[PDB]
Write a structure and sequence with these properties.
The complex is a heterodimer.
Chain A (H helix, E strand, L loop, with lengths): L5 H18 L5 E3 L1 H12 L4 H10 L9 H16 L5 E12 L6 H11 L2 E5 L4 H15 L15 E14 L10 E8 L2 E10 L3 E6 L5 E7 L4 E8 L4 H5 L4 H10 L6 E3 L1 E5 L1 E8 H4 L25 E2 L3 E8 L3 E13 L1
Parallel strand pairs in A: 2-3
Antiparallel strand pairs in A: 2-4, 4-15, 5-6, 6-11, 7-8, 7-10, 8-9, 12-14, 13-15, 14-15
Chain B lengths: L3 E3 L4 E7 L4 E8 L6
Antiparallel strand pairs in B: 2-3
The chains are: A alpha+beta, B mainly beta.
The complex binds a molecule of 2 linked components (Z9L-Z9K), chloride ion (2 copies) and sodium ion (NA).
PDB class: hydrolase
Keywords: serpin, inhibitor, kellikrein
Assembly: dimeric
Chain lengths: 341, 35
């Protein structure tokens, strides 16, 4: 099972969303919570004492209910499952450590990251800032089939390690759209702002959807070929904030369970845009407000990575992209975490 | 018109792994003509 870690991961997902949505309202948002969670859980293998438990608590783990071993083995199983072959669904998740050519890293840390997160180890010269940025960014770009470019946008000269992970997702719709029916249509951004978008249309299929009687929204769940689904949640005009206030793991499960009853499987005329959005986040600036003050402070104990220098957190980035069209969805993301001395 | 959905105003997106019960991606489309 990776079911033991599912509650914490979902809690983190919705906490992160809520912070972004409330701090930058009226803006496109897109991220991979799984990528962030897995990056930071991997990092925690190198943290000691209070710093280790605080990273896991920030990620939503209840360390009275779960052992550290339950968390890490949960991720190992989660990542293994995602990486297994599928017919009309590609999911790949991977990790890497870019290690200073000079420094002696603790074998336990390196061994644990390889055993649990299947981390690939690369050696690089962090004095060569330009070359190291290119090496890391090219690796992420390649692993994301070109979607995540320039993940690491800054790198200090005193960095000795950069942790990265990535997720790549490409999945066909069970119920695809016929591209000859896609035509430009109006999209009402707000009361005064209207843009044109290619609008896909299907009207012959049954779909899983509801008009919520407790909340001002409708919810569509579309299945992919393979073990994935997407919820498209459509607040009534002007009611986005009201839905965001209640967007929790419990609400997602409510909607999911309502959409397991065949009375919510009905013929639907569905207009859905063909579109792309992306997100780009500076996690070292955001995560202190989601429980990670210790990690980003002068007090962080990262002495599980090396005994050779006193280490501290440097920059941490997250970028993600979403591409929706008539055949399916492509989504990619990556997370970096740099450590300096 | 209860059998129609038009995603022609801001909406939320939750991509979910049903084998691992993980939220893989989460987001909001406010203006889809920003890449
Ligand atoms: C806003 O509450 C009203 O709608 C509820 C359903 O809204 S929805 O979750 O967006 O579909 C309705 O309860 C329904 O919920 C079922 C469930 O628990 O899964 C089931 O228990 C109810 O049937 C026994 C079902 O009622 S129905 O859809 O009207 O057939 C609420 O009804 S309730 O009798 O108060 O529980 C509720 O209706 S009302 O108070 O506005 O008349
Ligand atoms: Cl840095
Ligand atoms: Cl009908
Ligand atoms: Na499926």
């Amino acid at each position: 099972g990776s079911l033991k870690i599912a509650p914490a991961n979902a809690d983190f997902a919705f906490r992160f969303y809520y912070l972004i949505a409330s701090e930058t309202p009226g803006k496109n948002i897109f991220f991979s919570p799984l990528s962030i969670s897995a990056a930071y859980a991997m990092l925690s293998l190198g943290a000691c004492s209070h710093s280790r438990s605080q990273i896991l608590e920030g990620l939503g783990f209840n360390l009275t209910e779960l052992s550290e071993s339950d968390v890490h083995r949960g991720f190992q199983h989660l990542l293994h499952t995602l990486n297994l072959p599928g017919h009309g669904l590609e999911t790949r998740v991977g990790s890497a450590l870019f290690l200073s050519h000079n420094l002696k890293f603790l074998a336990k840390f390196l061994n644990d990251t390889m055993a649990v997160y299947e981390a690939k180890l690369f050696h690089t010269n962090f004095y060569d800032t330009v070359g190291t940025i290119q090496l890391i960014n090219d690796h992420v770009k390649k692993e994301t089939r070109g979607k995540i470019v320039d993940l690491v946008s800054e790198l200090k000269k005193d960095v000795l390690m950069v942790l990265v992970n990535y997720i790549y997702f490409k999945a066909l719709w069970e119920k695809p759209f016929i591209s000859s029916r896609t035509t430009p249509k109006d999209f009402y951004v707000d009361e005064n702002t209207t843009v044109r978008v290619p609008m896909m249309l299907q009207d012959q299929e049954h779909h899983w959807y509801l008009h919520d009687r407790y909340l001002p929204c409708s919810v569509l769940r579309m299945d992919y070929k393979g073990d994935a689904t997407v919820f498209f949640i459509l607040p009534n005009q002007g009611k986005m904030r009201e839905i965001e206030e209640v967007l929790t793991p419990e609400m997602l499960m409510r909607w999911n369970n309502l959409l397991r009853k065949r009375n919510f499987y009905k013929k639907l005329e569905l207009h859905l845009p063909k579109f792309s959005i992306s997100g780009s986040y500076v996690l070292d600036q955001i995560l202190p407000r989601l429980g990670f003050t210790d990690l980003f402070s002068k007090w962080a104990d990262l002495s599980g990575i090396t005994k050779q220098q006193k280490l501290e957190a440097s920059k941490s980035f997250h970028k993600a992209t979403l591409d929706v069209d008539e055949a399916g969805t492509e989504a990619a993301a990556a997370t970096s975490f740099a450590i300096k001395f | 018109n209860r059998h129609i959905l038009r995603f022609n105003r801001p909406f939320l997106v939750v991509i979910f792994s049903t084998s691992t019960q993980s939220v893989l991606f989460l987001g909001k489309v406010v203006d889809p003509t920003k890449p």
